Amino acid sequence: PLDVALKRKYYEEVRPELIRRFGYQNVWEVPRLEKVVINQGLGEAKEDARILEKAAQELALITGQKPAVTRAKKSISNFKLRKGMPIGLRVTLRRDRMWIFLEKLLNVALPRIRDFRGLNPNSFDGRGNYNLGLREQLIFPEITYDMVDALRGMDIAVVTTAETDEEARALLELLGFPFRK
Amino acid sequence: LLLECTECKRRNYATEKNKRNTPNKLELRKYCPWCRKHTVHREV
Amino acid sequence: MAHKKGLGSTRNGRDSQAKRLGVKRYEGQVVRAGNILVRQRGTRFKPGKNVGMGRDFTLFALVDGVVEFQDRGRLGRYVHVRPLA
Amino acid sequence: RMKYRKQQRGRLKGATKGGDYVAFGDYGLVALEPAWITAQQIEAARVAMVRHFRRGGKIFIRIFPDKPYTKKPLEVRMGKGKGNVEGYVAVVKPGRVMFEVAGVTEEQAMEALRIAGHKLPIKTKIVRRDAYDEAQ
RNA sequence: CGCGGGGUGGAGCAGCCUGGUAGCUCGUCGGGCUCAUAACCCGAAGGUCGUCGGUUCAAAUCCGGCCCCCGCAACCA
RNA sequence: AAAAUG
RNA sequence: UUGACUGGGGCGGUCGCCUCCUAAAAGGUAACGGAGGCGCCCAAAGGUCCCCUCAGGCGGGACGGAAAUCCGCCGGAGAGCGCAAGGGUAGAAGGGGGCCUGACUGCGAGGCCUGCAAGCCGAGCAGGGGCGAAAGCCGGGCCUAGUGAACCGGUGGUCCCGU
RNA sequence: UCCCCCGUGCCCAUAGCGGCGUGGAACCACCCGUUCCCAUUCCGAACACGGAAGUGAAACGCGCCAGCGCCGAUGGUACUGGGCGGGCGACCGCCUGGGAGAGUAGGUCGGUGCGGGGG
């Protein structure tokens, strides 16, 4: 709860193999890691007393921070909800809180993800940093089955201080990021 | 609406203008009277 | 007679009255305080040394003196009053 | 086919734009007098152009109508004309190169344009090339 | 030339100035009754709302552009 | 004292 | 008593105000010339202090259009600025937040415009206030339309007059 | 005096974009932490405070490059105060002063006051 393996390992284990594998010089020219943004979209805040500040904190538990209720930037008549208010929850884990969450992700969630075979090595596709979305919200150790009253996963982004997806891809293949080659 | 503010317990007017249906009623706010300096001035 | 049958789809007779704008006091003109210097649409001329503008962007002198104009490109065009002796 | 229109007659001064140069094609048709050329005219020329040498080469019509020509219904006065009615036109100042041909013999080309000129309500002149350019 | 009324499932009429819900009768379709047809009975379907776009979160509905449809005026010499 | 045709 | 304009009159259209153009590079400028708005709206859409910066385009991302919400670059303004157009504007007039009510009272140098009478801007002084540590800013709203002399009355108020 | 750097103003793109190497002693930044001040519709990311271990990789500073951007003559015309001819007209032309816009040659990856810290 201050320092965790993933974090730990990253240093006394990942850095090296990387320094070598690729071949750097300044520890800062390295493939640091610094931001994870688990964000939800939900679907609405429409009729029938739709509070949905429920999955709000449901999300908090799975993470640590409180998400920010997101609001509409435009208005679309096509599918209801327009102009303002509405919802689109988001949260930003940095340092500590971040490391851990990932570590919890990469050792319990994904596993267990419905079926699972790996991850999409094309999701970076090149542009530094990654991305991915989970369908179920109950694929987390903290939350329960007798808890969730309705499925609603989301998507999480992650940021690399490196550029080439090559690098980025290595850094995560090392951090334990599985890959459906 | 053509509103004006009657300093409670005296005279004077400010001659404002509210928007009724558009959240109104109970208009009143610190204004400066002629009979010495400030009070609040109600509606009416 | 040999009459016709003309009519008017005229739906254009209209216009607002002129509001006469522009530099009212060009550079070099000695002016007293208050003399509005420029009547402008927007901020066509930014206020400079000893010059203030009000609600309608009308720029006017703040002291007694000569009017001086100035270009500042990316910054804009300014107008001000330089006092004297 | 656009924008807000039914515009002012306006006039044609010196032909400061009456005198370009064969841009594509090989030979050409430059205008000598200023005027408004009704689309009706352009086509009526172009057509006869192609039609002169059935299954021939390419025709380039650099001029292009866009000016709305209005006109009253046969009455008196009361607001601008119904306008258009007949249509649009292009403005040609003495010197502009209206049409230009290519991919054909001069005997065929030259004689082709000559006809066009009869269609246009102006006086024309025919040109070759090798002139202006931006080379060194 | 000008006014003003109107284009909505197959036919004939609502709904539009008071923007979000397309209503009625007839007929089309399925099932009954009858020896059978009608009639009668039960149950369904079916509409780019004339078109080319504009304003709006949203247009049968509000604003302009023509295309056919209908009426009223077009007088003094 | 009684609810069309083939 | 049953208006005027009017390429004769009638019929038709129009009648005040705002914005482009016509308008000929100061203003101003006609025509039954071209083309659109207004007869309202905000108790926050107003003060001030403190923060933030758009629209798009390109990838990457559970449901997910072709822009719902996220992440990453590029993007000086093409967004925004309540409603027409124009000018202005991110070195903010735009987006958000905290306290507020100067959408004050007495005044008003000096000008703009102008036949009149109207309309418009306005520093500064006084009083008693707001926001800011402060310098300071504050007499409504990015700005121009949203309006109507007098007479006759109506409601209040008050030093006045009252045969 | 002439270098280097931290604040700042001015000229307001010839200082821009994008490339290419360099700079850490100083400065500057990034960094080290979140106990206190104060912080983010959730994040000390940004604001902020306390520290200085490590770094010049980011960012900034300083140089070189012309591919993009920006600038840009001279000539020569268009147009034109004023004056003036020809032709029936449509239009054409001269005299006398002014004189672009495009395009060419070419220029440019800055210039410059003020105050500081260091050799």
Q: How many CB pairs under 8 A join C and D?
A: 15
Contacts of A115 (CB under 8 A, 6+ apart): none
Separation of A90 CA and E12 C1' (Å): 59
How far is residue D89's CA from residue D84's CA, in Å, rounded to a whole number?
10
Pair A39, A66: CB distance under 8 Å: no
- Structural contact between residues C70 and C58, judged by C-beta atoms closer than 8 angstroms: no
Beta carbons within 8 Å of C38's beta carbon, 6+ residues apart: C22, C23, C24, C25, C44, C45, C58, C59, C79
Residue-wise burial string across D80-111, b where 16 or more C-beta atoms lie within 10 A, e elsewhere? eeeeeeeebbbbbbbbbbbbbbbebeeeebee
For chain D, list the contacting chains (3+ Cβ pairs, <8 Å). C
Q: Both tokens of residue A30?
A: 């390295």
| Way it was determined | cryo-EM
H or E stretch covering D17? none
Tell me how far apart the alpha carbons of residues A159 and A168 are, in angstroms, rounded to a whole number. 9
Task: Report CB contact under 8 Å: C7, D78.
Answer: yes
CA→C1' distance for A155 and H60 (Å): 36
Q: Which CATH code is given to the segment(s) C20-85?
A: 2.40.50.100
Distance between CA A70 and CA A83 in Å, rounded? Answer: 13
The residue in chain C having the minimum alpha-carbon distance to the alpha carbon of residue D79 is: C10
| Contact: C5, D76; criterion CB under 8 Å | no
Residue D16 in tokens: 């400061």
Q: Does D10 touch chain C (CB under 8 A)?
A: no
Q: How many residues are given for chain D?
A: 136
Token readout for A83 is: 């102009």
Indicate the SS3 state at residue C39: strand
What does DSSP say about strands A93-94 and D58-61: parallel, antiparallel, or unpaired? unpaired
Select from D75, D77, D84 the residue whose CB has the most chain C CBs within 10 Å, as the one to mutate to test that interface. Answer: D75
Nearest CB neighbour to D76, from listed C6, C9, C12: C6
Distance from C-alpha of C68 to C-alpha of A12, rounded to nearest angstrom: 69
Counting Cβ atoms within 10 Å, is residue C29 exposed (0-12), middle (13-18) or buried (19+)? Answer: middle
Chains that touch C (3 or more CB pairs under 8 A): D
Taking the CA atoms of D68, D74, D76 and D78 in sequence, report the sign of the dihedral they define. negative
